[PDB]
Amino acid sequence: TALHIAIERRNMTLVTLLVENLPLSLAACTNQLAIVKFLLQNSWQPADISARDSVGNTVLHALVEVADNTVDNTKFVTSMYNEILILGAKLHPTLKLEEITNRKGLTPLALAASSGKIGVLAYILQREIHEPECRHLSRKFTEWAYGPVHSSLYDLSCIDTCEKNSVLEVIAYSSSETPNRHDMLLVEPLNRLLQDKWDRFVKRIFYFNFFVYCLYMIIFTAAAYYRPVEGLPPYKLKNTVGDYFRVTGEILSVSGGVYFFFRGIQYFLQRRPSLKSLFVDSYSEILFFVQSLFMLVSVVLYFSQRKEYVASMVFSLAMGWTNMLYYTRGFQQMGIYAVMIEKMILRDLCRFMFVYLVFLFGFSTAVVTLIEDGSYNSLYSTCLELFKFTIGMGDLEFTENYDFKAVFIILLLAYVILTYILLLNMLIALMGETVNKIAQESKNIWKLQRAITILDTEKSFLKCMRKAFRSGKLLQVGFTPDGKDDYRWCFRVD
Amino acid sequence: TALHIAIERRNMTLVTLLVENLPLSLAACTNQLAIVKFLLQNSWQPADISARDSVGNTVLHALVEVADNTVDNTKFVTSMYNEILILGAKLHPTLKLEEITNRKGLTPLALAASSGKIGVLAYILQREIHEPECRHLSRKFTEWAYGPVHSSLYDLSCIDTCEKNSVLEVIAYSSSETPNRHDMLLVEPLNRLLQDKWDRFVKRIFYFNFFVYCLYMIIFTAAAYYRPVEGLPPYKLKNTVGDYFRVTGEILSVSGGVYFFFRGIQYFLQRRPSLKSLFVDSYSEILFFVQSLFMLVSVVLYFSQRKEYVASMVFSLAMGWTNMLYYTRGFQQMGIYAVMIEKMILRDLCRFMFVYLVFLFGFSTAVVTLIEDGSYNSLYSTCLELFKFTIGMGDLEFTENYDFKAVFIILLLAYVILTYILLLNMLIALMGETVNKIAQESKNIWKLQRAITILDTEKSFLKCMRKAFRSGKLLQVGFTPDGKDDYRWCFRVD
Amino acid sequence: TALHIAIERRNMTLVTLLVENLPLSLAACTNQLAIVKFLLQNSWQPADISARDSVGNTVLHALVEVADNTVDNTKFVTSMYNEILILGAKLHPTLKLEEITNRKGLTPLALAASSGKIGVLAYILQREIHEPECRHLSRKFTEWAYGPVHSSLYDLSCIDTCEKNSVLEVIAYSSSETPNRHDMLLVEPLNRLLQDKWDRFVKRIFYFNFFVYCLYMIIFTAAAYYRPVEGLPPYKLKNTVGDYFRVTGEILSVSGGVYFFFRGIQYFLQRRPSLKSLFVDSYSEILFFVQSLFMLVSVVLYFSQRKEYVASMVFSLAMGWTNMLYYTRGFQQMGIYAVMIEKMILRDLCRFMFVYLVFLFGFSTAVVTLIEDGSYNSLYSTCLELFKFTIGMGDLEFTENYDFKAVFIILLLAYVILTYILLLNMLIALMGETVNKIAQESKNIWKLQRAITILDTEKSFLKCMRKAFRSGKLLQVGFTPDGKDDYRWCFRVD
Amino acid sequence: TALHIAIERRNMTLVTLLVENLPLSLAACTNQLAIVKFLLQNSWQPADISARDSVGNTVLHALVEVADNTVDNTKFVTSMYNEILILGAKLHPTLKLEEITNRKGLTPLALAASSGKIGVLAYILQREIHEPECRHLSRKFTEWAYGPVHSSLYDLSCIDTCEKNSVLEVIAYSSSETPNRHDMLLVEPLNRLLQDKWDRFVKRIFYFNFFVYCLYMIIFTAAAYYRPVEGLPPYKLKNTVGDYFRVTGEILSVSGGVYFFFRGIQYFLQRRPSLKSLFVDSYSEILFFVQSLFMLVSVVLYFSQRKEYVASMVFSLAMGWTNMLYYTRGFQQMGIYAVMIEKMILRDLCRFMFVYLVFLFGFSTAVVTLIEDGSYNSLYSTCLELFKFTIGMGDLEFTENYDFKAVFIILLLAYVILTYILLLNMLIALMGETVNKIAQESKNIWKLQRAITILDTEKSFLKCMRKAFRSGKLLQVGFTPDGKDDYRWCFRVD
C-alpha cells in the first residue's frame, strides 16, 4: 500500500523519493501531471504499463472506466491519455495494450462502447498520428492534401470483428439502458460504414424481405377471408381446385408463421436479457413472436375440433397487418414517423387511459346506480353509452328511466364537459408538446433501427460468402515495430 | 436620534463624533460598510447586536426582512451578513444570535422562508466556515475531498423540528401567495432529505393508503350498485347472506366516509385560513370533504324515509371515483400530468365557458324566439339542441316550424361557425400554448405535493416512534465555546 | 438658399464666415455638431430659435418630424436636441418654445404622439434637470433618493389637457394606422395614470354600466320570449297585468336601443373618419350601432302591420347577447382572451372560408350534376349534405340515385379527405401558430381598450365636478424666469 | 503540366522562375495570393486573362464554379476575385470578360444563378467601384448624397434580357433541385423590379385573367347543372332559346378547355423537363392540363353516343373549381396560406394515409373474417363501416352477427383507440409542428410564384409593345474606353 499512502499525500516532488522503496490506480483514479510521466523511470524499478491490476484489468480499461463524459474532464483526459499511451508505446514497441482484454473479456474500445462514451469512443476510433515510429497506434491516415480537396482513410479494425465481437455490435446491442446508445453511431466512420453496407447489399435484400412479407400477408389474408363455414374443423377436402388453392394458402400461412416463431425465439436465445430490455426495447421482435403464437394456437384449435380457431386466427391477421409497419424503417420520412407513433403510444396511452378510465368508470357506475327497472340497467351497456360520447355519437337522452332525471342530466353534462371538451383537447395539446420534444429522439432511433437491420443481415447472411469487407487488401503503413508489410482493409472517405 | 441623523447624512468621518452622545435600524435599513463595521467600536458604548429593537426583533430578523432576493443585492448582502455573523461570533462567544425568536416567535431562518427567499434562505441553510474555533455557526461540513470524489455533511437542525416548527413546514405550509414557495424546496438539503424520507417510510405507507382507498371505493361502488329498489328506506333485513353483505358494504362505506369527514375537518381546524389559501390552495381536502358531506346527507335522507338518498349517494360515488386521481401524486409520470390537468381546468374553464355560454344562451333564446306553436317550443330543449352541435350531433333541421326558415337557417349556421368551428379550435390552440407555458410550474407543484405527503405522514404517524432522524447521533465538531461534545444528526451527501 | 448649400458643403471653418452675410432646416434636417451652436451665437446676427419656417412650423416641430425611431439615430437625437434646447432656453429665458402650435395646430408633444414615437415621446414626457436656472424646462423631479427607496413627481402638463387636447387622447384616438398607437402607453406616467383613474372612479362606473346593460339584455330577452302569437301587429292590450309587464319590457327595450343608437352616432360625428379607422378599428361601436339599427327596423315593421318584425327583432337579440362580450375589457384574463378571439375571427375567417367554400361549392355542384331524377336534386340540399360532414354527421350514402355510384363515392371520399381530414386539421394548426404569434399584441390591445374606456368616461362624465386632478396643489420649483410659485397638480410616484 | 506541378508544390518564390518555361486553373482551383497578381507580369509572357480553358470556360466561369457558398470562404473570395478582375480589366480595357459564354452558352452571371449562388451572384449583380477609369465594370452607382437621403441608379443589364436569356429567368426556371432557387430573388434589385412590374402591368392583367377564369368556371358550372337527361347523346336541338343558352355554355366550356390544353402543352414544349420538375414542381400547370384532358374525354364520349361523358365531365368540373385556388397567388395572405396547404398535402398525405390504410385494411379484413351469414359479409361495406369511425359516425354495433361478439368488440375498440383517438390526434399534432417548421419557406415559394407569374405575362404578352423597360434612356457614365455616350435603361432606387 506504499503508493496508496503516496498518492494520499499527493505531493508533487516526493514521488521521486518514495519509489526508492498500484501504478494503474495512480494513472487512472488520479491522473496527476508528474506521476504518470515518471512511473516508467523510477530509480528502484519502473512501472510495467502492460501489467494487470488486482482483478486482471490493464491500464487502458481503468483509463476508460474513469472517464465520465464531461467537457472539461474530456479536454484534459484526451491529452493526458494520448501522451501517456504514446510514451508507453514508443518505449515498448513489441506489444500493444488495447488488444488484451479485461477480466470480462472486453477490449478498451468494447468497454468504452458498452458503458456508453463519446469523447473516449471517438478518441479511440479516430486516432491520428503524423510522426514516424508513432503511426503504430494510429487509425486515421491522410493520402491527399489539396486546398479544397481533403481525403483520408480509416482502418476500421474491430468494427467488423476482432474475431470475438465488434464495437458496432456493442453499441447496437447494448442493454437499452445505456445513456447514449444512439449517439455513439454519430462517430466519423460508423455512419458512413453503415451507409455503404446499406448501399451495397442490405438495401436490396431488406426490400426483398419486405416484398416477400407483403406477399405472405396477402396470401394469409386471402386464406382467412375464404375460410370454410361449416362447424367441427378440419374439413373433408374435394378435388375442386378451390380447395387446393385454399390449402395452399393455409400451408403458406402456417409455414410463414412458424418460420417467424423460430426467428423470434432464436433472436431471444442469442441474448437472454434479464427481463429488462424486453420492456425497454425489442418491441419489433416481441410483436412478431406474438403473431406466431396466435397462429399456432389457431392451428392447434383447428385440428382440435374447436370452432373458435377463427377467434385466434383473426387476431394474428390483425396483428399481422399492423406489423407491416415494422418495415417502415429504411425510409427517410416513413420510418421516423412510424417510430414517433410507437413511442407516443408507449409514453402516452397508459397515462391517458388511466385518467379517462377513472372518469368513465366513475360516471358510468354513477348513472347505472341512478337508473333502475324491474335496457341500460347493465353496467356494460352504460359503459358503452358513455363511451360513445368520445367518438361523437353521445345521445344525452339515451334512456327515459325516471327517478331524478335532473341529477341524471347534470351527471351526463359534467361527464361530457370533463371528457369530451376538456380531456381530449388536453390530450391533443400534450401530444403536440410531446412531438415537438421527441423529433430528435425519433431521428436517433430510426438510425438505430437501420443499424439493427444491417447487423442482422450481415450476421445471419445464410450464404457463407465474404460479402462484408470494405475496400480490399489495402496496404496502409508498412512501418511497424517489425519491418513487415500490412493489409488491414481500410475504408476511404473524402 | 443622534444615530438617525448620523445614518441619514452618511458622512464617512463624522460618524465617530455623533456617537459620543437605533444601531439595529442603522445596520439593517441601509447596510453601509462603515456603519456595520463601526457600531461595534463606538467611543461611548458599542452596539449590542444581540439586543432587540423597539418591537422585540433582533438584528438578524431585520437583516432578513430588508433583504429583497435579487442577484446584485444578494451578493453584497451575503458578504455583509456573513461579516456580521463572524464578528458577532468571535466577539460574543457565549451565545448564538439566530436562536432568539422575533416578536412573532420566528427565527431568521423561518422568517426568510415565510417571506420567500432563495439566496438568503440558501445562505442561512448552507453556512460554511474555514477557521478553527469559528465552526460554532457552521452548517456545511466536509469529510472526503479527492480530485473527483467530494462528499459533505449537513446538520439539518430545525429542518425536521426545533421543537416548535421547522423550515420545511414553513416552506410547504406557506400562505399560498408567497412568490417562491415551490422553488424553496430545490435547495441542497431539502430536496435530498425529502427524497430520502420518501425512500425510507413514506412511499410504502402512501401506496398502502392508496390500495386501502381503492378497496374502499370498490366496496362502496358495489354497495351502491346492488342497492334495493323498494320505496321508503330503511328496509327490513332478512337472514339471507346477501343482505348481510350489502349491509357490510354500507357500513364500510359510511365508516370510511365519516373518517374522511374527520380528516378534512381536523385539517381545517389545524389551519383555519382566512379564505386566502382556502381557494388558491387546499383543493384536494375540500374535495374529499365534499364527498364526505354528500355521504352524510345520503345517510340522513336514508333514515329520513326519503328516496332522494339515491340522488345524494351517487354524487358522492361520482366524486369518490374522481378523487381517486388525488393519489397520482407519488408517480413521476402520472402525478405531474394530473396536476397539469387540474390547473388547466382551474385556469381555463371559467373563461371558456363564459364565452361559450354567452353564445349558447344568445342563439338558443334567439331561435326559440323565432319558432312558435299552439316540440322545441321550450327554452330548455332548444338549449339542448344547440348544445348537441358541440358534441358533433347537431342536426341543422331539428324542427319544421315555419315562420322564416331562412333567418332560422342563417342563425343556426352562424352559431355553428362561431361555436363548433371557431371557438372549439380556439380552445384547443389556447390549451396548446398554455401547456408549453405551464410544464415547469407543473413539475414544481408535483414536487410540492410530494412534500405535503411526506410532512403529513411524518407528523401524525400514529406510532409514537422516532422514525424521523437521518443518520444517528453523529459527532460533527466537538469544539464549542465550551469543551463539550455534540450530537446533531448530520446527513451525508456527495 | 445660401444656408442649404452651406450645410451640404458642411465645412467646419466656413460656418463662421458665410454667416457674415433657413437655420431651422439646417438644425433639423442635418443636425450638424458645430453649425447649430454657431447659428444662435453668430458674430453678425444670431438666428431666432423661436421663429417659424416658410409654412409656420417652429424649430421643435421639425425636430420632432425628423426623428424616425431608430436606436443609433435616437441616441444622437436625444443629446443633440436636449443640448440645443437648453442653450436656447438659457439664451431666451422669457419664452417657452413648446407651447406654440404648428400649422396644423399641434404642439411638439402632440405631433410626436400622432406620428407614433417612443424615444422621442418618452424624452418629451420625462425631462429631468438637476441644476438651478435650468429646471425651467424640466418635467421630472426627485424628492427622495436612497439606494432602494426612491420617490419622485411628474408634472403631467397636457396629459390632462392643454385647453385643446391631451397627449393621451392623441395616442388613443390615433388614425388606427399609426405604427405605435399601442406602445405609446408604455411610458412611465401614462400607465400609472390610467391605473389610478381606473382605481378611482372608472372601475365602479364601468361595472355599473355593465350591470345595467345586463339587466337591459335580460329585460329585452324576456320581452322577446313572451311576444304575442297573433298576426297583424300592433295588438290590442288588455288590463291584465301581464300585458303591462310585456309593454314595460318592450318600452325599456326600445328605449335602451335608441339610446345606443344615439351613443354610436354621436361617437361617429365626434370623429368622422375617412373610412380608414372605420374598418381597421371601431368594431365595438359599429356592432352596437348595428344592434340598434335592427331594433329600429323591428319597431318600424311592428307598427307597419308586418309580421317580419319578429325576424328583425331576433337578429338584434342575437347580436345583443354577443355584444355582452364587449364588457370583457376590465378583466385581466377575460378581456385579453376575448380580444384574441376577435382578432382570430378577423384575420382568419375570410382566408379559411374562402378555401372551404371553394371546395364545398365545387364538390356540391359536382355531385348535384351527377345525380338526377324525374330529393337532393336541388343544389341547396346537397350543399347542406356536404356541409354536414364538417360537423361530423356526414352520411356517405345520402342518396340512392344511380348513374355511376362509383364516381359518386369517389367524389365524396375525396371531399371528405380534403375537407374533414386535411382542411380542418390545418385550420387548427394555423390557429395554434396564430395564437403563439398574437400572445403579446393582445395585452397591448386590452390596455388600449381600457384607455378608451377611461377616456370616454372622463369625456362624458355627466356630473360637471372637478374629480380629475392628480395630487393637489403640490409646489415643485419656485424658480421660474419669474420668481413666482408654481401650482400645476403634479402626480406622486415612488 | 508545368503549372500543375508548380501549384501542387505551392512555393511562394519559385513562381518567378518556373514561368521562364493552366492559369485559369491556378487562379480558380487554388486562388493563391502571389501567383494571380504575378501571372500577368511574367518574364517570358503574361497570362491572357481573357483566354479560355481546354473546354471553353473563361476565367470568370471557373472563378464562379469553384465558389461553394461558405461565409469565411466567401469573404476571401469577393476581395480576391474583385482585385484580380479589376487589374485584368485596367490592363485590357478594350474587352469585357463577362460577355463570352461558356461551353454551355451561359454567361458567368447566368452560370452562377443556375448553380444557385448567393455571395457570388450578389457580387456579380452589385459590383461597386470608387475610382476614375475603373467604373467601367460597375453596376451600382451613387448619384444623390444628402444627409438623410441616399439614392442611386442600377444598370440591370441582362436582368431583363441579354438577347438570349436573363438572370431572373434562370433563378425562376431553375431545375427545381437548386438549393437556393427561391432565396436568389432576395438580391437588391430583383425584389424591387418584380414589385414594380407587378405594380405597373402584371397586377391588372393577372386580376383580369382571374375574373375571366371565374366567369369561365361559372359558365361551365351552369352548363353542367342544366345538362339534358335523355339517353344517347348528342341530343336534337330545338329553337327554344334555352337550348341556345345551353349550347352557348357548352361551346364556351369546351373552347376554354382546349385553350387550356394548348397552354399546358405549349408550356411543356417550351421546357421539356427531364421528368424531374414534373414531380418536384410544376403542379400548378399539370392540374390545369389534367382538367383539359378530362374535358376532351367528355366531349369525345359525348359525340360517341355514350352516357359516361357525365362521369368525365364532373371530374373536370370538380378539378376546375379546385384549380380556382391557383389564383390565390398575388395576395399577401391568401396565396401564402394556399401554398402552405398544397405543401402540407404533398408532404403529409402519403405518409399518413399509409399508416391509416394499413390499420383500416387490417381491421376490416379481421372483422369480415369473423362475421358471416348465409349484410356486411362483403369486405367493401365493412371497409366503409370502419371508415365511418373517422368521421364521427362509428356505430360499435354495426352488425348482430354472432360467433364471438367478445373478440369482435375487442377488435372494434382497439381499432377506435388506434385510429380515432391516437393516430388522428397525432396527425393534428404533426401538422402543428410542420406548420411552424414551414412558416418562412412558404413566403419564399409565394414570391417565387409571383416571379413565375410576372415572367410568363411579360414574355408572352401578345402585344409586341415595349411595356418592359424600367426608367427610360438614362445615361450613366459617358466615359468609356471610347469617348462615346451611353444609354442603358437604368432603374431608380431610393
What is the distance between the alpha carbons of residues B341 and A430, in angstroms, rounded to a whole number?
10
**Cα B474 versus chain centre, distance:** 33
- C151 three-class SS: strand
Cβ of residue C430 closer than 8 Å to a chain D Cβ: yes
Cβ of residue C339 closer than 8 Å to a chain B Cβ: no
Cβ of residue D426 closer than 8 Å to a chain C Cβ: no
Out of C314, C338, C390, the one facing B366 most closely (by C-beta) is: C314
What is the distance between the alpha carbons of residues D141 and D488, in angstroms, rounded to a whole number?
13
Closest CA relative to residue C412, chosen from D253, D384, B420, D301? D384
A306 is in an annotated binding site: no
Neighboring chain C residues of B30 at a CB cutoff of 8 Å: 146-147
Containing B55, the helix (H) or strand (E) segment is none
Report the chain D residue with the minimal C-alpha distance to residue A309.
Answer: D370
Residue with cell 380608414: C276
CB of B370 within 8 A of CB of C311? yes
Q: CA angle, A414 as apex, A408 and A415 as ends, to 5°?
A: 90
Closest CA relative to residue B450, chosen from B41, B168, B261? B168
**Window 50-89 of C, Cβ < 8 Å to D:** 66
Report the chain B residue with the minimal C-alpha distance to residue C312.
Answer: B407
Cβ of residue D409 closer than 8 Å to a chain C Cβ: no
Distances from the Cα of D415 to the Cαs of A181, A311, C158, in angstroms? 34, 16, 70
Cβ within 8 Å, pair C407-D439: no
C-alpha cell at B152: 459533505
Q: Please name the residues in contact with B456: beta carbons below 8 A apart, sequence gap of 6 or more.
A: none
Residue spans of alpha helices (H) in A330-423: 334-370, 379-388, 405-416
Cβ of residue B7 closer than 8 Å to a chain C Cβ: no
- C-D CB pairs within 8 A amount to 115
Cβ within 8 Å, pair C311-B422: no
Report the chain A residue with the minimal C-alpha distance to residue B393.
Answer: A393
Cβ of residue D368 closer than 8 Å to a chain A Cβ: yes
Cβ within 8 Å, pair B321-A361: yes
Cβ within 8 Å, pair C318-B363: yes
Cβ within 8 Å, pair B229-A30: no
Cβ of residue D320 closer than 8 Å to a chain C Cβ: yes
Cβ within 8 Å, pair C322-B362: yes
Cβ within 8 Å, pair C404-D349: no
Distances from the Cα of B36 to the Cαs of A288, B16, B101, D327, in angstroms? 77, 13, 22, 78
What is the distance between the alpha carbons of residues A321 and B158, in angstroms, rounded to a whole number?
63
Q: CA angle, A316 as apex, A311 and A317 as ends, to 5°?
A: 95
Task: Report, in angstroms and rounded to the nearest whole number, the Rg of chain A calculated over CA atoms.
Answer: 32
**Cα D258 versus chain centre, distance:** 25
Cβ of residue A416 closer than 8 Å to a chain B Cβ: yes
Report the chain C residue with the minimal C-alpha distance to residue D340.
Answer: C426
What is the distance between the alpha carbons of residues B479 and B486, in angstroms, rounded to a whole number?
9
β-bridge partners, C152 = C142, C493
Cβ within 8 Å, pair B387-A396: yes
Any chains having at least 3 CB pairs less than 8 A from chain D are A, C
C-alpha cell at D217: 368556371
What is the distance between the alpha carbons of residues D404 and D401, in angstroms, rounded to a whole number?
9
CB of A219 within 8 A of CB of A187? no
Containing D137, the helix (H) or strand (E) segment is none
β-bridge partners, D145 = D150
Cβ of residue D387 closer than 8 Å to a chain A Cβ: no
CA distance C430 to chain B (A): 9
**How many alpha carbons fall within 13 Å on the CB side of residue C491?**
21
Cβ of residue A231 closer than 8 Å to a chain D Cβ: no
CB of B72 within 8 A of CB of B25? no
Cβ within 8 Å, pair B314-A30: no
Any chains having at least 3 CB pairs less than 8 A from chain A are B, D
Q: Please name the residues in contact with C149: beta carbons below 8 A apart, sequence gap of 6 or more.
A: C494
Closest CA relative to residue B372, chosen from B359, B362, B363, B382? B382
Cβ within 8 Å, pair C392-B392: yes
Neighboring chain C residues of D439 at a CB cutoff of 8 Å: 433
- C273 three-class SS: coil
What is the distance between the alpha carbons of residues D316 and D325, in angstroms, rounded to a whole number?
15
Report the chain A residue with the minimal C-alpha distance to residue D379.
Answer: A225
**b/e per residue, B30-48, with b = 16+ CB within 10 A?**
bbbeebbebbbebeeeebe
Residue with cell 417652429: C58
- A-D CB pairs within 8 A amount to 111
What is the distance between the alpha carbons of residues D491 and D494, in angstroms, rounded to a whole number?
10
Question: How many Cβ atoms sit within 10 Å of the Cβ of residue C400?
Answer: 8
What is the distance between the alpha carbons of residues D238 and D246, in angstroms, rounded to a whole number?
11
What is the distance between the alpha carbons of residues D135 and A344, in angstroms, rounded to a whole number?
63
What is the distance between the alpha carbons of residues D7 and D27, in angstroms, rounded to a whole number?
10
DSSP annotation of D135 reads G
CA distance D91 to chain A (A): 29
CB of B390 within 8 A of CB of A421? yes
DSSP annotation of C174 reads S
D399 is in an annotated binding site: no
DSSP strand E in B229-364: where? Answer: none
CA distance C426 to chain D (A): 7
| Range B2-178+471-493: architecture per CATH | Alpha Horseshoe (1.25)
Cβ of residue B296 closer than 8 Å to a chain C Cβ: no
Any chains having at least 3 CB pairs less than 8 A from chain C are B, D
What is the distance between the alpha carbons of residues C195 and C470, in angstroms, rounded to a whole number?
12
**Cα C458 versus chain centre, distance:** 17
Q: What is the CATH number of domain C2-190+478-493?
A: 1.25.40
Closest CA relative to residue A249, chosen from A275, A279, A219? A219
Cβ within 8 Å, pair B425-C439: no
Neighboring chain D residues of A427 at a CB cutoff of 8 Å: 421, 425
Cβ within 8 Å, pair A310-D29: no
Containing B360, the helix (H) or strand (E) segment is helix B334-370
Backbone dihedral angles phi then psi of residue B491, each to the nearest 5 degrees: -130, 135
Cβ of residue B273 closer than 8 Å to a chain C Cβ: no
Domain ranges of chain A: 192-324, 334-460
CB of D78 within 8 A of CB of D119? yes
Out of D365, D394, D423, the one facing A221 most closely (by C-beta) is: D365
Closest CA relative to residue D138, chosen from D461, D486, D422, D494? D486
CA distance A323 to chain D (A): 9
**Cα C217 versus chain centre, distance:** 26
Cβ of residue B380 closer than 8 Å to a chain C Cβ: no
Question: How many Cβ atoms sit within 10 Å of the Cβ of residue D256?
Answer: 21
A471 is in an annotated binding site: no
DSSP annotation of D140 reads B
CA distance A115 to chain B (A): 19
**b/e per residue, C332-359, with b = 16+ CB within 10 A?**
eebbbbbbbbbbbeeebeebbebbbebb
